[PDB]
Amino acid sequence: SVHHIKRRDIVLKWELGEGAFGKVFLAECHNLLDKMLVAVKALDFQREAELLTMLQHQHIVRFFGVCTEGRPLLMVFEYMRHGDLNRFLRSHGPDAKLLAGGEDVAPGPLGLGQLLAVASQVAAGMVYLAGLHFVHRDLATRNCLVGQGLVVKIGDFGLPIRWMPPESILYRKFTTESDVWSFGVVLWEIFTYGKQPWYQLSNTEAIDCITQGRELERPRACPPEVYAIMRGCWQREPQQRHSIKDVHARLQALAQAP
Amino acid sequence: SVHHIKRRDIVLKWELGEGAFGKVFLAECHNLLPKMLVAVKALKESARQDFQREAELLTMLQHQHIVRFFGVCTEGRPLLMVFEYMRHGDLNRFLRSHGPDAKLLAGGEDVAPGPLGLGQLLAVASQVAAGMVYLAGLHFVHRDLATRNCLVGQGLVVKIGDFTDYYRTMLPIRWMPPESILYRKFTTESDVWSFGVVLWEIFTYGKQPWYQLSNTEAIDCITQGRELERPRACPPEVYAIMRGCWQREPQQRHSIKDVHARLQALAQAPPV
Ligand SMILES: Nc1c(N2CCN(C3CCCCC3)CC2)cc(Nc2ccc(C(=O)O)cc2)c2c1C(=O)c1ccccc1C2=O
Ligand SMILES: Nc1c(N2CCN(C3CCCCC3)CC2)cc(Nc2ccc(C(=O)O)cc2)c2c1C(=O)c1ccccc1C2=O
C-alpha cells in the first residue's frame, strides 16, 4: 500500500541533482507526519514504488510514498543532507576540501572509527536484504546516502563491472553472494576515500583482472583485519565467500576499540 | 583526403578498452611505413557518415601533440580507425595511477611510481597547451578538452587524443565555462577555460572538478562564478595561470599562446 501525497503539501525549494530518470529536488512537505524537508524524485514506476513501500529498514533510505496528482510523477524520500556516500568520502579524504556540512562532520579524513561505522551501516542494510532473499545487483558508494550525524543508508536499487564478481561478469549470475562481493568492493571504496575500483585500468582491462583473479590493492589507510574482510568477500567461488551476517558482525566488533 | 589501409595488413593482438566509439585494440599493421604497433578503433553501429567526416578532420589535423592518425579501413566490418599506440593510455587514469597513495600497475621503468616532479607536471601541461595552440591557430574548437581525452606515450609524451563526466546531447559541464552552459557558446576562449580545468586535473592527479558536488550543484557553482580550490600540489604561479583561464568574461581570459609560453617558461625553471 503506497502512501499517496497531495501536491499542495509538496513545495519545491531547489534542485539537488539529476539521476538516471530525472531531477531530484529538496522540498518542504506539510502534513506528512509538522512541515519538514524531504527529497523528491521526478519523471511502470508503480512496480518500483510498491517495492520501496515493501523494503523498510534503519539503513535503507526512508521512502515516504508518491504523488500522482498532476504530472510529473513524484517519489518522496527523506532528505539525506550530505548526499551520496561516494562524493562524501571524496570530500573528506587526503587532499580534499569540504564545501558544506563541516559543523556536522569535521573537515578532513574520517579516521578508523567513523569509516568502520560507515561500513557497518551499509552491511546492516545488506543483512536485511539477504534476509528477504533480495539481490541488489548494484551495491556501490554512489548508491548510498549520508544524513545528519553520519548515518548511512542504502539509497538506490535501479553495467557496473568493476563492482561485480567473475560469475556476474561472465555469466550474468547475480545472487546474495555477488552482492557480498560488491560489498567487499564498497569496503575498498570507503577505505580509499572513494576511488574507483581499478582506477588505473580501462573497463576491458579491469574485466580481465577480475576474471583472472587479481585482487584490488590494500588501501594505505587499511588495517590488515579490514583488508581480510574484503578478501573474505572476494573468494573466486561464491559458496566460499563470507556471509553478509558474518561480515556485519566482524565490522561491528572492530568499530568498538578499532 | 583519407589514407585507406587493407584489412589483411591489420592484425588484432588484444583489446585495450571500450569507448563510446566501439572497442579499441592493440594491433600490428604492415605496409604503413618502412610491421609496427598501432591502436585500432572499431566502430560499433548511419554512423557511416559520422565516420567519413571524422576521418577527414583527423587527416587534416597533423601536429606533434595530436595523436598520429594513420587512416581508416573500410573493407570488411567493423569500420576501423588506425592511430599510433600511446603505451600509458589516457592521461586521467595515468595521473590517478601516479597519485600520492595510488599504485602503479605498469610502465614504472618509464615513469617512476609516485607523484611526478613539478617539472614533469609542467611538461605534461605545456604539451597539451601546444596541441591547443595548434588548434586555435586553425580557428578550431575542441569542445571537450579534458585529461580523459589526452593520451600519454613512451617517455611521458602527451598528445590531444580524442576530439559521470557528462550531463544529459551530452555536455561535459564540469569542464565548461558559463557561456557554454548558459548559451551553448563554444569558442577558443571556452577551450582556454577547459584548458584551465585540465591544469587543475594535472595538479590534482586526476580528481574530478567539483568532485564534492552533483552535476546540478556544479553548474550552479560555475554559473555563479565560483573557482576550483587550489590543489595542495599547486605553486601560486601555476594556480595563477588557472585563474587566468577562468575569467567569467571570455574576452578577459589568457590566450592559449600566453598560457603555453608561460608554462614552457615554468617547465624550464620550475618554482619552489
Ligand atoms: N542530498 C542529496 C544530494 N545532494 C545534496 C547534498 N549536496 C551537498 C552535500 C554537502 C556538500 C556538497 C553539497 C550533495 C548533493 C543529491 C542527490 N542526488 C544526486 C547526487 C549525485 C549526483 C551525481 O553524481 O551527479 C546526482 C544526483 C540526492 C540527495 C538526497 O538526499 C536524496 C535522498 C533520497 C533519494 C535521493 C536523493 C538524491 O538523489
Ligand atoms: N594505450 C591505450 C590504453 N591503455 C593501454 C594500457 N593500459 C594501462 C595498463 C595499466 C597501467 C599503464 C597503462 C592503459 C590503457 C587505452 C586506450 N583506450 C581506452 C582508455 C580507457 C578506457 C576506459 O576508461 O574504459 C577505454 C579505452 C587507448 C590506448 C591508446 O594507446 C590509444 C591510442 C590511440 C587512440 C586511442 C587509444 C586508446 O583508446
Quote the ligand 2 centre to B157 CA distance (angstroms): 14
Could you tell me if the CB of A200 is within 6 A of ligand 2? yes
Residue B158 β-bridge partners:
B152
* Beta-sheet strand order (sheet of B69-73): B10-18, B23-29, B36-42, B80-84, B69-73
CATH number attached to the domain at A1-79: 3.30.200.20
**Which three cell numbers mark B218?**
556544479
What is the domain partition of chain B in residue ranges? Answer: 1-85, 86-266
Residue B31's φ and ψ, nearest 5 degrees, are: 65, 30
Which pairs count as long-range contacts for A224-233, CB under 8 Å and 24+ apart, including other chains? A225/A254, A226/A116, A226/A187, A226/A191, A226/A254, A229/A184, A229/A187, A230/A184, A230/A185, A230/A187, A230/A188, A231/A184, A232/A184, A233/A180, A233/A181, A233/A183, A233/A184, A233/A185, A233/A187
Residue that has been written with the C-alpha cell 578577459 in this structure: B252
> Does the CB of A217 have a partner CB in chain B at under 8 Å?
yes
Q: Scanning every residue of chain A, which has its alpha carbon at the shortest distance from the alpha carbon of B231?
A: A95
Domains A1-79 and A80-254 share a fold: no
CA angle A231, A237, A238 (to 5 degrees): 85
Kindly report the backbone phi and psi dihedral angles of residue B216, in degrees, each rounded to the nearest multiple of 5, phi listed first: -70, -40
Q: Experimental method for this entry?
A: X-ray
Q: Is B89 helix (H, G, I), strand (E, B) or coil?
A: coil
Mutate to test the pocket of ligand 1, among A12, A13, A15, A16 (most ligand atoms within 8 A of CB): A16
Sequence-ordered strand ranges (E) for B169-241? none
Instruction: Tell me B31's DSSP state.
Output: S
The CA distance from B33 to B82, in Å, is 13
Q: Reduced to 3 DSSP states, what percent helix, strand and coil does chain A have, rounded to the nearest 5?
A: 40, 15, 45
- The rounded distance, in Å, linking the Cα atoms of B41 and B23 is 6
What's the gap between Cα A141 and its chain centre?
5
What is the Cα–Cα distance from B125 to A208, expressed in whole angstroms? Answer: 32
Range A80-254 has CATH code 2.30.30.30: no
β-sheet bridge partners, residue B10: B29
Q: Cell numbers 525549494 label which residue? A: A13
Structure-block grid coordinates of residue A201: 585500468
- How far is Cα A116 from Cα A181, in angstroms, rounded to an integer? 18
**Phi and psi dihedrals of A27, rounded to 5?**
-150, 150
Architecture of domain B86-266: Orthogonal Bundle (1.10)
> What is the CA angle A129-A130-A136, rounded to 5?
55
Of the candidates A80, A58, A79, A77, the one whose C-alpha atom is nearest the C-alpha of residue A67 is: A77
Please report, for residues A62, A162, A233, A242, the alpha-carbon distance to residue A238 in angstroms, rounded to integers and kept in the order given: 31, 17, 9, 9
What cell was used for B102? 595510488
Residue B238: Cβ within 10 Å count: 24
Tell me the one-letter amino acid at A48.
Answer: E
C-alpha cell at B138: 586553425
The Cα-based distances of A144 to A13, A58, A134, A218, B209 in angstroms read 23, 13, 17, 22, 21
Q: Is B107 in the pocket of ligand 2 (CB under 6 A)?
A: yes
From CA A150, how far away is CA A120, in angstroms rounded?
12
What is the rounded CA–CA span in Å between residue B69 and residue B26?
Answer: 14
CATH homologous superfamily for B1-85?
Phosphorylase Kinase; domain 1 (3.30.200.20)
User: What grid cell was written down for B140?
Assistant: 578550431
Task: Return residues 122-161 of B near A (CB < 8 Å).
Answer: none
